[PDB]
Design a protein around this ligand. Structure first.
Ligand code: XKC
Ligand code: XKC
Ligand code: NA
Ligand code: NA
Ligand code: NA
Ligand code: NA
Lengths: 459, 459
């Protein structure tokens, strides 16, 4: 019930400041999981609690809620608002789905491919919310097949969101906590390096996911799917000038992000804000003044400001952990794991994060777990990335439960799914994801991020 | 046109870093006034431009957009969302309007009083947007009288918003820039001290405004107004449990704000966030779990995140002015005004700000002008508050033009007003406001803020 979580754990207030910060973290974790209050309010919890518990005054807590990473996230969100306003993502989805074909096997393959492609660029939640009505209409035109399609959309959304930093919230959390916890790691993790690490691993996960979903789960089906896709594409309209301009702005954003990393002042946030500003200037109509691609009304009503606040609250939580001495204490506690081989530690932590992310949101999961794992990484003399990157990727492995991720909730909302079949698929899904992430880290993540040696920025 | 402002001043890019920061400030001022791009995007301009012009890297610019003041503003906005969701402000307005009476003179007096009272607590824009439909319905049930009522609503909204820090955006700007430009002035300006300074001055302005509007501008009118107010109050419904809980939470917020100032960790932002969090916990319905007073959907759709970004951009602009050396250069330039008596300087600056605020938004006006005036204040050895407080109050004197403030735009939207009559009223309005602010500063502002002596925090 709500009363038991509102009263009993909250009234546990009385010690050492690290104990108080640990209590703040535990209370925020409980509010993340149970969601008695909204996620944004739980992320505002540090502003209330750190000054009260004498860990950080209001100034230091408040200056954590908007950072370089958070501004980059906001710029990406504004660009995504531009993409969704003009149905560019829907156009790409329908065009590629008509290209791949409509026979059921190729149909599922195409849906997963387009969902993962658009998730690399748009929020997992928004990509799912756009894609799942398409299969809803197609299936409206077999219980096993409905499960297969609706599931594979949510799974592909999560997997594809893992590909880029701005694709999903856990990656933004990872970037922000890398800046917060390891300031001397200036640009080691960026759009180019993260893409190089995660895109092959995303492709491997998507391939195994499609194979598994085809393992567990006709002319008429092909014809009906082709008809629905053709109808949707027609009513979408011809390729407009605004859609072309949004596409050009997004290509420019991607090109600048990738060319930033083939005294540094310009960052990925500068590029994202530049492209968003262009979206507020570039005309949306035939010049022949026409309205721009974006106005502030739609931008404000479509940007998830709650997620912005949640990222800021995660940064404040990491700052409080460093200031209160909690990170040092946790490192001292997890020190005797130095004897354990790092591969086993990565397996166990990835499995633990994949289990935990089935209960609360992925972003909250990675927010809670990244500081602890970073503290252990500097405790046992291990490269923090070798622990955090598998943790960040596994936080997105929200496969078992509808409450695991908003894509899963959207997918469950339409029906067609028991929790039993979803968890039966999701357990092998999590096993596959952990395997793929383990290989990605142990093989080519080593070369990309120099996971062999203990870095200087980790002291 | 849009092209001339998008191309010609923007393409002036080439010098010294202070010149580049001055160019950034001038470009942002032009975008504020003309509003070719939305205000939030113009406030994001520092993130794009300071790294490009080598003034501040993206990290330092981005850590300015959420501060203690900005979090306090957000908490106040959330509390205001709670107030507007349950029509508590409308209930207070209708109850007090029925208490004061409906005869035309007392009717205008009551409307101005309730508008100023609710503006002390709610945004000027939101207070105006709620109040003006009431007089629209009343007048629906004389051109001079319509002008009088619609005007006095907007003027009372601005004047009442001057009363508290969270009442209007310029006061939030003043608090934020006082923290940014004068860090050693920790809590000199706070809710209690600002209220003590501005409430008597707000009352004086409102009294003279009512007198002037009665100077320039029956039983049937009284009966019709009373009938409309009674109808609105009936359809408002009886005093609900949620309304009482929102009222109690707001009283608690006010009491904590005033009792904060009869190593400091708790600030006004901590109190505001605490009360907002309570609003997300406190039940809105008879317990007999019922939904809380606020959920995040309405909070996100009702909070003006653009204004949050604009305040952050103002803080970043002040930070860039300090870092680039522009503030020092401006102080050197305005040094030879040390011979001018401070009272004359205050008069001229208040008149200049009152003139400028007729063109762009009040918040943008005070954002642009406060750093320059602070630099001059430390140039000529004058108390910065003696210049900034009249500047902050005069920024709210948006009386002449509909584009001067969103309350003025809302008021002009309903009609009943030429620009000619509005400016004719507004010129004497600005004269009255400047007079009242001059007296407030020269008399009791001196005692409250120690305006006589050059403070230590101003170096
Ligand atoms: C990029 O982040 C987001 N953007 C927009 C919205 C509306 C929500 C989010 C966070 C949720 C998630 O990160 C998945 C999860 O955390 O379960 C996702 O990518 O949709
Ligand atoms: C408290 O600030 C605000 N809150 C909410 C909204 C929607 C807008 C604002 C800023 C505008 C103004 O500050 C007046 C002006 O600047 O002209 C006001 O109080 O409405
Ligand atoms: Na995504
Ligand atoms: Na999750
Ligand atoms: Na107000
Ligand atoms: Na103005």
């Amino acid at each position: 019930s709500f009363v038991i979580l509102f009263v009993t754990p909250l009234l546990l207030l009385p010690p050492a400041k690290f104990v108080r910060c640990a209590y703040v973290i535990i209370l925020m974790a409980i509010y993340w999981c149970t969601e008695v209050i909204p996620l944004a309010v739980t992320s505002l919890m540090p502003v209330l609690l750190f000054p009260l518990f004498q860990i950080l005054d209001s100034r230091q807590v408040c200056v954590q809620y908007m950072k370089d990473t958070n501004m980059l996230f906001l710029g990406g969100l504004i660009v995504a608002v531009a993409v969704e306003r003009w149905n560019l993502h829907k156009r790409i989805a329908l065009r590629t789905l008509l290209w791949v074909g409509a026979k059921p096997a190729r149909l599922m393959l195409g849906f997963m491919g387009v969902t993962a492609l658009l998730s690399m660029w748009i929020s997992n939640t928004a990509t799912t919310a756009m894609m799942v009505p398409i299969v809803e209409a197609i299936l409206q035109q077999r219980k096993r097949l409905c499960k297969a399609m609706t599931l594979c959309i949510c799974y592909a959304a999560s997997i594809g969101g893992t590909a880029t930093l701005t694709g999903t919230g856990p990656n933004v959390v990872l970037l922000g906590q890398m800046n917060e916890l390891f300031p001397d790691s200036k640009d080691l993790v960026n759009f180019a390096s993260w893409f190089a690490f995660a895109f092959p691993n995303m492709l491997v996960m998507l391939l195994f996911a499609w194979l598994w979903l085809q393992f567990v789960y006709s002319k008429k089906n092909e014809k009906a799917a082709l008809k629905v896709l053709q109808e949707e594409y027609r009513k979408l309209g011809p390729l407009s000038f605004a859609e072309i301009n949004v596409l050009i702005c997004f290509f420019l954003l991607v090109i600048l992000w990738f060319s930033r990393d083939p005294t540094k002042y310009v960052s990925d946030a500068t590029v994202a804000i530049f492209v968003a500003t262009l979206l507020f200037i570039v005309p949306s109509q035939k010049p022949k003044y026409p309205p721009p691609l974006l106005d502030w009304k739609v931008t404000q009503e479509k940007v998830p400001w709650g997620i912005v606040l949640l990222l800021g609250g995660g940064f404040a939580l990491a700052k409080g952990s460093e200031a209160s001495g909690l990170s040092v204490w946790m490192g001292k506690q997890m020190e005797p794991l130095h004897a354990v081989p790092p591969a086993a530690i990565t397996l166990i932590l990835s499995l633990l994060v994949a289990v935990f992310t089935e209960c609360t949101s992925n972003v909250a999961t990675t927010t809670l777990f990244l500081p602890i794992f970073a503290s252990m990484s500097r405790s046992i003399g291990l490269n923090p990335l070798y622990i955090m990157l598998p943790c960040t990727l596994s936080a997105s492995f929200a496969f078992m439960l509808p409450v695991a991720t908003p894509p899963n909730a959207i997918v469950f909302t339409y029906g067609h799914l028991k929790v039993a079949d979803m968890v039966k698929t999701g357990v092998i899904m999590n096993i596959i994801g952990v395997f793929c992430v383990f290989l990605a880290v142990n093989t080519w993540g080593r070369a990309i991020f120099d996971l062999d040696h203990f870095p200087d920025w980790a002291n």
